Design a protein around this nucleic acid. Structure first.
Lengths: 64, 79, 50
RNA sequence: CCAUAGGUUAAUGAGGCGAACCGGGGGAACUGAAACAUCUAAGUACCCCGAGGAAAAGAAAUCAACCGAGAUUCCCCCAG
RNA sequence: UUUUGUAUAAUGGGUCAGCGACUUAUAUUCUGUAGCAAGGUUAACCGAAUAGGGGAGCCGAAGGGAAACCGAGUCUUAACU
RNA sequence: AGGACCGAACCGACUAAUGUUGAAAAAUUAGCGGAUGACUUGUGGCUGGGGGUGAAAGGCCAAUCAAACCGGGAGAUAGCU
RNA sequence: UGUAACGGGGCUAAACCAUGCACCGAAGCUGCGGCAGCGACGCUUAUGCGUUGUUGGGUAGGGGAGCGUUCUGUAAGCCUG
RNA sequence: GUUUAUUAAAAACACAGCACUGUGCAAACACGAAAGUGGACGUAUACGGUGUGACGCCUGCCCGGUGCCGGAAGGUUAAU
RNA sequence: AAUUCCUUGUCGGGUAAGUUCCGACCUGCACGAAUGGCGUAAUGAUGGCCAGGCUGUCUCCACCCGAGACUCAGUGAAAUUGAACUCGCUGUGAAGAUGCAGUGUACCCGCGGCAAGACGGAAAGACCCCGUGAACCUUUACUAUAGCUUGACACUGAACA
RNA sequence: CUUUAAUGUUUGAUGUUCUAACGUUGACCCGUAAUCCGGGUUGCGGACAGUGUCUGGUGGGUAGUUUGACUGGGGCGGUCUCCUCCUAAAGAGUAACGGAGGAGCACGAAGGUUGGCUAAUCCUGGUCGGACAUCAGGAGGUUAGUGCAAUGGCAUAAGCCAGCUUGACUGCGAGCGUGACGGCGCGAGCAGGUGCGAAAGCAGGUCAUAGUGAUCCGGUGGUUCUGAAUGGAAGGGCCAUC
């Protein structure tokens, strides 16, 4: 039938204008007093999927 | 008994090589671990924290031995 | 793990807070510091813990 | 004691079979999760009851959104 | 055939003849080719019916942001700095 | 009199040999244990599979038993050959 | 198990060292004939080609081009007593 | 006496005896989804479960742990 | 010792000689009192040991009688099998060679025999390991659950302290 | 309002009595020339027993499963993440059940800045000072020290002391290093506010390298974001944090 998307991957990724996917940085959910403000400040923006993981993300998201 | 444990680092030496045209802030000598094998004196003072020596101007790396203690210095000179 | 996590709450009326560690065995007094409050954009007193 | 229970006779109907479809009562496990227990498989297989040429459902105590549509059923989108 | 490596004393087969293993459906991406060119294309269905109708819809021409929102800009942030 | 003794039919199966593509998917030959008893046997019945039955070995339940056989889920699954 | 610690015969040089020349010796190189891939120019286009340089061991695997079998159109055509 | 009918017949199992324990009858316990049935047309000298295993002499010490039996003062404690 | 590792413990008897046997000692690795302790007449196709008789069990085999095996006539399988023009030795080699190298030996083909080899045949090793394999069994593993049991409400009411 | 030997009038624990639901595997009668089952009469028990729903305990009696990997076979033992040295061949990297050791923190000062200072050890005279406590002098030169392993550092000290303080700030960040990735690390400089200095200037944590845990789920504070008819709210999102 139709391919079913990995709904967890649909929750973790959104697609950009040229193709390629934008995700949220890890290590900002939990135990944040230990981390420096430079580290958490750099983890605050969204990042791009990094070309080795693009095949896995495109496989998980056939409708993006 | 048992004694098989070890740590990890994946670079410990210079990257600028005195012909290297390093721009902006490139780490000339990262994970030197210490300010004493190399000091930074050409482009102001590098050696921020963990004593990583970095450029401050766009230019060629320069290695030199100055001072009364025969200490090795990394300088950045313009092209 | 004798040091335990505490907050530092702004005295400027905002909900902004910092977090740090403190051991109550050696320093039972409350920690007060002038820290930057980004909502007020000024340095104010931060004292209150969790 | 009255009466009911019971008994006998008569009339009418039923019974059992049949491949699939349909409605209802009950209902797994292998499997997948790269183990497994929530989950899945799946209300599937199977068992049972009942009916018809179809069955079931069906004429809003339904949606919608301040505009409106006007019973049920089936197909294509919506839309993985 | 399996292996680092088999004449191997590792596997398989007595021989012949016949049969025997990458298919099908739907969805998605890429390539080749063909039609049309900011447009392309219809599904169900209607229809003497491979025609024709039907543009419901789907994809593309616009993105940024979690979002409202803004829009060749947009988010971040007091601040295109 | 006796779950008495010896010993045939009858029931069983301790040893040895033969047979091991057997005459036989457990037998033959020479001995062997019980042989009035918790014996043996004919006919018919009853107990049905996480069940029965078991003087108990996981024995037996149609040459099948740490879960019978048949049909179905079923083309289970097989990172293995 | 049988010479069995030059491959054997056998060698007093047919052993070892030094120098020299010659020859044998491969699917290596060259000669002659032929096929194919890739690249660079020339005559200019679903361009036929030529010149020239070079390449062509292959498992897993990737790419390219094809042979043959059954069936359908072409096919009431063609072959065929 | 019985036993792995088809590699083990034994010291294994059973046994008469012995003890513990349950059971007052619509008994305990068992089969059963329930009716019902066995126990039993029996009635504590009876029935079940367990362990030991004729007979003779005997069976000592330990209740801390785990079971079982008895008690409810206190603590904890469900649905409501 | 159905129990003892050391261990063939040590002592005694039996024997010419006894790791087994029988009687003791206690130094019980690691017996022990209904998981029963110790003994026990009779019983046992029960385990170990000794002796008399008896013998081909043996020294050490010999002969004979039958059924096969052997020949002839009739009928007529089987496992197995890549193909075979299917020797020995020494070495080499996926490391134990009929097949490779060197060498020696050997006319071609049956029949009766023996099994040293063909890592002979049979059974996709049962021992060992592996698989995020299976089954069954155990428990004080985890999660459930039948049963047993506790209470509330309902079936379920009326008086009196 | 806390209480009264008749009155306006409830709730909950046992205890006694009754019968009238319920039980009867007591007796008798009928259906019926039936050990069943009903109905009737009566006796006994009696709101108990028993059953339904909910619920705490117990529950290998059953049922589904789990019970790691490396490993000079497996099991036993040991190990699994992070840091330092050597192996490691003078760039980086580099294995073994190779050789040695540490970490799962600490510090509101042991951070920042300004000002100042310089050790270990040895030889001598003096109060229990003795070989080593504290002075004074000389030699020496970092043989010390670093909050904690090891290595590389460190005198312009990053080692020791004092004053003032919170830059152990917020948003960003050209440019790099290192990873397959998740990520991790270094960073001049810009803006807003600070601190220490007369000033140049320095400070976005500690001499550096260990001191750690993704995601999901959920909690707390904030928020001109969303909020399934509208206004809210619940819930979700974003930021900080657990």
């Amino acid at each position: 039938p139709k391919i079913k998307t990995v709904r967890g991957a649909a929750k973790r990724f959104k697609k950009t204008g040229k193709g390629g996917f934008k995700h949220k940085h890890a290590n900002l959910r939990h135990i944040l007093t230990k981390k420096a403000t430079k580290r958490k400040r750099h983890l605050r923006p969204k990042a791009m999927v990094s070309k080795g993981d693009l095949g896995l993300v495109i496989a998980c998201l056939p409708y993006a | 008994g048992g004694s098989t444990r070890n740590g990890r680092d994946s670079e410990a030496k210079r990257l600028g090589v005195k012909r290297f045209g390093g721009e902006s802030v490139l780490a000339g000598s990262i994970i030197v671990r210490q300010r004493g094998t190399k000091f930074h004196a050409g482009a102001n003072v590098g050696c921020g924290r963990d004593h990583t020596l970095f450029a401050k101007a766009d230019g060629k790396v320069k290695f030199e031995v100055k001072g009364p203690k025969n200490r090795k210095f990394i300088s950045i000179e313009a092209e | 793990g004798i040091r335990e996590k505490i907050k530092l709450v702004s005295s400027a009326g905002t909900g902004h807070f910092y977090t740090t560690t403190k051991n109550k065995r050696t320093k039972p007094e409350k920690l007060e510091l002038k820290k930057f409050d980004p909502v007020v954009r000024q340095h104010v007193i931060y004292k209150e813990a969790k």
